[PDB]
């Protein structure tokens, strides 16, 4: 990494001089806790029929959505103390911070 820098790289590289990939694009996320997969290392919970997580069936995500999340939308509560811009800036901010690629078909 150049020992002299006026502006930032586009890739985020060289921000940290000791460890110059940290925060740069196209690297792995950092893990604050050891990961939790059905097979130890790869398979997501729910993958294999009949495999419990910590001794209990894995709940279908759409079931959890249906039973806990869904509500009658005409009964929605407006926030007296936050504008819609408060949600929108969050999305715009998320898009400065993280994008997790998926294969294409």
């Amino acid at each position: 990494c150049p020992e002299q820098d006026k502006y930032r790289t586009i890739t985020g590289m060289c921000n940290n001089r000791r460890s110059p990939t940290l925060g740069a694009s196209n690297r792995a996320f950092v893990r604050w806790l050891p990961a939790e997969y059905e097979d130890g290392f790869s398979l997501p919970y729910g993958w294999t029929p009949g495999v419990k997580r910590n001794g209990f069936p894995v709940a279908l995500a759409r079931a959890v959505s249906n039973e806990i999340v869904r509500f009658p939308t005409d009964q929605l509560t407006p926030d007296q103390e936050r504008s819609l811009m408060f949600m929108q800036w969050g999305q715009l901010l998320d898009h400065d911070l993280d994008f997790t690629p998926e294969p294409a078909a």
């Binding site: 502006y7 930032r8 586009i10 985020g12 921000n15 940290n16 001089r17 940290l22 925060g23 740069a24 694009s25 196209n26 690297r27 792995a28 996320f29 950092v30 604050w32 806790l33 050891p34 990961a35 939790e36 290392f41 997501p44 729910g46 910590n54 209990f56 709940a59 279908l60 995500a61 759409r62 959890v64 959505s65 249906n66 039973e67 806990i68 999340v69 869904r70 939308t73 929605l76 407006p78 926030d79 936050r82 504008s83 819609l84 811009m85 408060f86 949600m87 929108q88 800036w89 969050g90 999305q91 901010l93 998320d94 898009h95 400065d96 993280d98 994008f99 997790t100 690629p101 998926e102």
Partner: protein
């Protein structure tokens, strides 16, 4: 197997199965599409799978400028030395720039209104066209860049294109930094968590890891609870704009045509400023426009964003709720009664226990958004811990943090302290009346609105280079 049309579970596909008695999807043999996120080390039996961030973790306006050097070059107007970003060459918005159009192999925007033939936009991040409200914010920042570059050229005529571009970019980055940590995050976390997770800035620390943590990609989707089911558009009296002032969201995903042909970004921004967010409530988590009709105009089935969030966390190998509470130094409820105490809601505790069996298996997004909100914030203690912790690292671990000695002069710092998102809208649109105080709290017209003239501009005098 194409994960978009197949319901077979074969790598790389992790489709959501349908429960019996689904209110929307009567066909149990159908599924909701899901591609597992790309592994860092594809194919390994030795490593523990992990996903990739394709962007810069830093708050550096990478969604404007790009996170890859080819793309960053392509976003630039390379026909002169003015240091500007490329602008649409086919359309304007009452004299003002639009984002250029991208050239995609499979362009979802073209599908939203087949007759208008308006493709998706090109920007620093690939998702700028997902909702016109997001596109309007991208369009705004692009315009602000070109304004700053113009003004810097006026002020420093000897400066070349590269110099202009870089100095304007450096300013736009600091503007995102300031809005985010001065105006936004305090209204996310609330004061208690803000003082705990984001104490007054001292200086850069080269030992602080500024990476995005896997869990953050899921926990920051808290904002899905704030989503309103319509896009609101308002005229220059802040009155509904006709014919269509309230468009259902399931008809605005990828709908770039609406920005180009239905009157530019001024009405969308007015809508944002003068319409409330949805409040997260324990019995009103997310709306049907994202839980039942997400992207229904551009795929074969409508998606369920909440359910996607929870499938994704499983895809990414995330620990469940109680592991994250332990991590944050919070009590970990075992029993349904204890979960009721932590949620201040015995009914919701029962509902979560009926699905999950133990609080240990609650998916982080679901547990996070279930927690009662902190005073004067809109997340609860667990999400405030995760989100606060992350944004601390992004500040303390960033060499080009705007307040760090040697990034700006003291004079330049004093100038930047004046910036505000309302002023930026004034400076880049046909809007002359904007939100007051914190744009993020101000929401009722006209009670919370002021004339632009009352607002001081960004003074670039300390950027003069003799």
């Amino acid at each position: 197997v194409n994960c978009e049309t197949s319901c077979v579970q074969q790598p790389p596909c992790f489709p959501l199965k349908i429960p019996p008695n689904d209110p929307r999807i009567k066909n149990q043999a159908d599924c909701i599409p899901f591609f597992r996120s790309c592994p860092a080390c594809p194919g390994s039996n030795i490593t523990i799978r992990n996903q990739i961030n394709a962007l810069t973790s830093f708050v550096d306006a990478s969604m404007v400028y790009g996170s890859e050097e080819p793309l960053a070059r392509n976003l630039r107007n390379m026909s002169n030395q003015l240091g500007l970003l490329a602008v649409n060459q086919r359309f304007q918005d009452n004299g003002r720039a639009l984002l250029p159009f991208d050239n995609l192999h499979d362009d979802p925007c073209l599908l939203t209104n087949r007759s208008a033939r308006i493709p998706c936009f090109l920007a620093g991040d690939t998702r700028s066209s997902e909702m016109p409200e997001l596109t309007s914010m991208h369009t705004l920042l692009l315009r602000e860049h070109n304004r700053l570059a113009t003004e810097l050229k006026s002020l420093n005529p000897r400066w070349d294109g590269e110099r202009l571009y870089q100095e304007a970019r450096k300013i736009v980055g600091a503007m995102v930094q300031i809005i985010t940590y001065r105006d936004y995050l305090p209204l996310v976390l609330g004061p208690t968590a803000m003082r705990k997770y984001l104490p007054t800035y001292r200086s850069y620390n080269d030992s602080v890891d500024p990476r995005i943590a896997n869990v953050f990609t899921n926990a920051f989707r808290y904002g899905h609870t704030l989503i309103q089911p319509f896009m609101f558009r308002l005229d220059n009296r802040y009155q509904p704009m006709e014919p269509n002032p309230r468009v259902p969201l399931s008809r605005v995903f990828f709908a770039s045509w609406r920005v180009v042909l239905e009157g530019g970004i001024d009405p969308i921004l007015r809508g944002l400023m003068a319409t409330p967010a949805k409040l997260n409530r324990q019995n009103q988590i997310a709306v049907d426009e994202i839980r039942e009709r997400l992207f229904e105009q551009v795929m074969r089935i409508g998606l369920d964003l909440p359910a996607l969030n929870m499938q994704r966390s499983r895809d990414h190998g995330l620990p469940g709720y109680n592991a994250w509470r332990r991590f944050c130094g919070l009590p970990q409820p075992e029993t349904v009664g204890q979960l009721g105490t932590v949620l201040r809601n015995l009914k919701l505790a029962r509902k979560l226990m009926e699905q999950y069996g133990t609080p240990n298996n609650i998916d982080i997004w679901m547990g996070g958004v279930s927690e009662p909100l902190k005073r004067k914030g809109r997340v609860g203690p667990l999400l405030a811990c995760i989100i606060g912790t992350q944004f601390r690292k992004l500040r303390d671990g960033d060499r080009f943090w705007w307040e760090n000695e040697g990034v700006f002069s003291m004079q330049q710092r004093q100038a930047l302290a004046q910036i505000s998102l309302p002023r930026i809208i004034c400076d880049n649109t046909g809007i002359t009346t904007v939100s007051k105080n914190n744009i993020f709290m101000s929401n009722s017209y006209p009670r919370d609105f002021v004339n632009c003239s009352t607002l001081p501009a960004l003074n670039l005098a300390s950027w003069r280079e003799a």
